Symmetry: C3
Subunit: 243 residues, 3 copies
């Protein structure tokens, strides 16, 4: 890999050198390792979350009683956990030989937290076994631990899949990097009101932008487009998780 030539940046004006934290350096190295090893594709999709939002908001007091805040992340975690079991190849890693897949029979999912010192991705174990309020409690606990530098490296291991949600900040879509040896990552951006054709007129529906990057060595185009379509369906009516 050819290196970037050094440039005397001070020839063009004043510069200031500030050091990178160790977390930023670990991160830089893992990202660059994933980038070069994984042939990335991003598949974009929009999910209609009008009803899902109404549910979330109508459970505000039950969430309050439980002392948890209920955001879209536990809902995304539950729906993805259901799909990782339905489409097992997303729940796998490429074996070090490059000639077999290791299918994981558990579902643990990490979620990205951007903290001032760098990115951490805490893992929730057995997501397919926890309820929405359990996941909400857990996600908040791990996020606060991540911010407080109090998270154990123990809790950043064993993920099958990652969710990276920027919806609280903005954006229409992005192309996340797969956290190798995982095979896929779901980016979530900001939901907005969009006109959706019902067959006769455009209705306003609250649409959530989804961006799935995947390792194309393990997942082909039709599989990935089937995963985001199924995820948009489950999010459009999450009672389907019950059958």
């Amino acid at each position: 890999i050819p290196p970037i030539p050094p440039v005397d940046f001070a020839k063009y004006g004043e510069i200031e050198e500030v050091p990178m934290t160790r977390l930023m350096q670990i991160g830089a190295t893992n990202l660059h390792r994933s980038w070069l090893n994984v042939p990335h594709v991003t598949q974009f999709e929009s999910a209609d979350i009008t009803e899902l939002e109404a549910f979330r908001v109508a459970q505000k007091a039950v969430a309050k009683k439980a002392g948890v805040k209920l955001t879209v992340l536990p809902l995304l975690l539950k729906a993805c956990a259901y799909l990782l079991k339905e489409l097992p190849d997303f729940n796998s890693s490429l074996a070090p030989s490059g000639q077999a897949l290791i299918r994981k029979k558990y579902v643990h999912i990490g979620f990205a937290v951007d903290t001032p010192d760098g990115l951490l991705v805490p893992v929730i174990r057995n997501v397919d076994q926890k309820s929405l309020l359990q996941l909400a409690a857990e996600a908040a606990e791990l996020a606060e631990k991540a911010r407080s530098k109090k998270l154990g490296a123990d809790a950043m291991q064993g993920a099958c899949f990652t969710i990276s949600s920027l919806g609280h900040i903005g954006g229409t879509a992005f192309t996340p990097i797969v956290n190798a040896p995982e095979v896929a990552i779901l980016g979530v951006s900001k939901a907005s009101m969009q006109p959706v054709w019902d067959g006769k007129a455009f209705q306003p529906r609250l649409m959530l932008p989804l961006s799935l990057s995947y390792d194309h060595r393990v997942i082909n185009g039709a599989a990935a487009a089937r995963f985001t379509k199924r995820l948009g369906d489950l999010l459009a009516d999450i009672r389907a998780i019950l059958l």
Copy 2:
């Protein structure tokens, strides 16, 4: 290229190792070879296909008589073949020295077929010479051969360009990988009804999402944006292929 560290995945739960087919392994290797050799950009565009869809549907019985099904692929194949001749740099490969281009004077186009054993990309030769019903017949024949493992490696050689259509499954857009030594690939996702401003009001138009990835060593930004704009124009009125 730093390798991904091996992880004992069984520390986190139960695992199952399943082998990769040879096709999946050939594919993994070509994809990773393209990924590292081609600096990729994807240019997105939406084509108004309202009239083109009306045409397709009104020729359903002539297609039936010919025993072919007429989908959007032959139409995409014809329009791309016309543009590969109009903008010759898309119809070329970089010479092994990296200092000349080999401009191809023929137009053969491959199209991706995802089969249970892996991805195959059959090639149709001299697309610019065949009619819409010839291409429809041919594309279906090659697709069935690809599924039946009966396709000759003969028929997976010599493409100038590739079309990867996921529209039958879903999605809004994706970022396909260039099938090197080709210089560009057209991803096609699902068409949907969108409000398009006519100058005074939004009309419902059926819009087809197009995603062109190209090798930026050979094609610059303005060339690629000109190719997708011209493709959206031809698809908005394909009678322009006649002049």
Copy 3:
């Protein structure tokens, strides 16, 4: 990096070998160097530029008197220069050790010009110090020099950030390559009239598609989504640059 196997392209029909200019070859090499060194993410956003367009058009005669044409580029240059000072990490380069950042205290911005011989990126120095008509005059001068092969390599050095605008040609969005050692590049595509929910109904607003690619070793997801959100805000009301 595995090489692409040579193919006898003439087995499939007639070929023509044409040479690459030196500029195309320099470019191919820098692009491929950036591609392999920078783990790229693209963050997409749409900015409401209805009022900004009305301003641009209402100043047509003052621009004329100044002999400059006022396009959206000087406006983009000023708004980005304001944000590079507000969010200093975008105005930096990774030190050759990979363990510190060099924060630049100046703001020079390059912009891509696609000329028949290849891509050039002229640099405007101290963008944060020039007015909209100064930048308009300068951008046009440098663009004409770039086309006339008369631009000095002097004038292609020292950029902190690059803007690549394809809006004059077309497209909905694209994924530009970071011009390393820079850490981010803003792609701009074609503005179009879109229905935007005001809380009660969809109004037609002129929306500008923005595509920010960044080096994820230096910039994380939340920072990049905050940069495009803030840029969409400044473009929605550029009087905010005054406070």
